[PDB]
């Protein structure tokens, strides 16, 4: 709510202060490029899918030219990049599973688990609280529509409420984006365990800045982005926004 060192972001929902790792990256890019900018705030949804053939949220703004630049958890995929050109992924991510702490690695083999394909036992793994109209939801629907359909009865609304249910043991696990799940596991108390493989990630992807389709500044910005990688100038920010304790 309306703190220094934070970009004044206007919330034109149909004047807060925004600060974070991606905010710092955008500020550094602006300093290296010397370009002005506002800070459009997405309110109707978070990212938005092709709802009834119509994009909403992040894509609903940028693709329909209501917005020009785009930052955030912009997953790179064919269903998103065909209409909006995506920059180089500055950070890597994917699909992982958030599970309880070391109290009851199970026999689950990830999404390729035999129990997923054959949930005929007394207690098979299911009920992952996938967020509605989410990128990972579309990924699992496209890859395995039957798997999502079988487990469709779960706790959709919120990630944080899913974390609370996992802490209470209501849900065995929750499959979501690798980066956010990893950061929460590193930050959540009680040493909430990562999926069966600590380094195991499914359909590995990245997060890139979604400029306008055919934007001329796309090519230089990536270079400038990797200019940071040229001097490893994002190491401290990655440590700050990724490292945890338990």
């Amino acid at each position: 709510p309306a703190i220094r060192d934070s970009v004044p972001c206007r919330s034109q929902l149909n004047k807060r202060c925004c600060k974070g790792f991606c905010i710092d990256i955008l500020k550094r890019l602006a300093h290296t490029i010397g370009f002005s900018y506002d800070l459009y705030l997405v309110t109707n949804g978070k990212h938005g899918k092709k709802i009834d053939g119509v994009w909403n949220g992040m894509i609903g703004e940028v693709f329909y030219q209501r917005a020009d630049m785009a930052i955030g958890s912009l997953t790179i995929n064919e269903e998103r990049s065909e209409i909006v050109d995506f920059s180089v992924p500055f950070v890597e991510t994917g699909i992982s599973v958030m599970v309880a702490r070391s109290n009851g690695v199970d026999t689950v083999s990830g999404l390729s688990d035999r129990k997923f394909q054959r949930p005929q036992e007394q207690y098979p793994p299911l009920k992952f609280g996938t967020v509605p109209n989410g990128s990972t939801e579309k990924n699992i629907r496209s890859n395995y529509p039957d798997m999502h359909s079988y487990m469709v009865r779960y706790n959709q609304p919120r990630v944080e409420e899913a974390l609370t249910q996992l802490k209470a043991g209501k849900l065995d696990a929750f499959i979501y984006d690798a980066a956010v799940l990893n950061y929460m596991a590193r930050k959540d108390e009680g040493c909430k365990l990562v999926t069966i493989g600590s380094g195991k990630v499914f359909a590995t992807t990245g997060y890139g800045i979604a400029l306008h389709k055919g934007s001329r500044w796309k090519r230089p910005i990536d270079l400038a982005l990797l200019q940071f990688l040229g001097d490893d100038e994002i190491e401290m920010l990655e440590r700050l926004w990724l490292s945890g304790i338990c």
Binding site: P89, N139, N143, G230
Partner: protein, 211 residues
């Protein structure tokens, strides 16, 4: 791996292919070679810039030096950077902050493949020009020779990409890898500037990540 990717592509968008190798056996870099005025790209990237090949399909590290003139799609795979070392029970480097990594000495022989993206990154890496001098005086002409030297203890350490070095250490055993992914990067595709097919290739990359 690259062969599998390229055959998958050729099956995907129905493009004929003529596969060939490079004689120099180096990635290439901006080097002001003898009887030349400025620095000229060498190796596979040099050939691609010269138009010898339509595009490069190799475990190439994404760097903006090539991106100034080479179109790069989304990385085919992701990897980092580590050091292959023969640390076995029959501390050399405890991490990126190890004083031996910071302070060069003749006890260890730090090496990388000549004309490599890691070599250029170390050259442009500040506060480690001593490491660049160590590279210049001790670089290995190839990754295979460095791996062989580390395996039989000629080379004390070999800085190399995380995925390939880890796979080699697992496959040939008798070796260990130290240092975490202190430089996260990706292996993708490289094509001529403004190549229309590269975009499709990028989508195909996602397809592989989907498939």
């Amino acid at each position: 791996f690259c062969i599998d990717l390229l055959i998958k592509l050729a099956r995907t968008m129905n493009f004929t292919y003529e596969v060939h190798l490079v004689a120099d056996g180096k990635f290439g870099t901006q080097e002001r070679v003898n009887n030349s005025n400025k620095k000229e790209w060498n190796g596979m990237m040099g050939e691609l810039l010269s138009g010898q090949a339509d595009m490069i399909v190799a475990p190439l590290t994404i760097n903006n030096e090539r991106a100034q003139y080479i179109e790069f799609s989304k990385p085919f795979k992701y990897q980092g950077l580590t050091i292959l070392v023969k640390k076995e029970i029959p501390e050399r480097i405890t991490g990126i902050n190890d004083p031996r990594l910071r302070n060069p000495s003749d006890k260890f022989i730090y090496a990388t493949v000549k004309q490599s993206s890691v070599d250029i990154y170390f050259r442009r890496q500040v506060c480690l020009s001593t490491m660049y001098r160590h590279m210049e005086k001790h670089n290995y002409e190839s990754a295979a020779e460095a791996i062989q030297a580390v395996r039989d203890n000629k080379l004390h350490a070999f800085i190399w990409d995380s995925a390939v070095l880890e796979f080699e250490a697992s496959q040939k055993c008798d070796l260990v890898t130290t240092g975490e992914l202190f430089f996260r990067s990706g292996f993708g595709i490289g094509m001529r500037k403004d190549s229309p097919w590269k975009q499709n290739v990028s989508l195909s990359i996602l397809k592989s990540h989907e498939n």
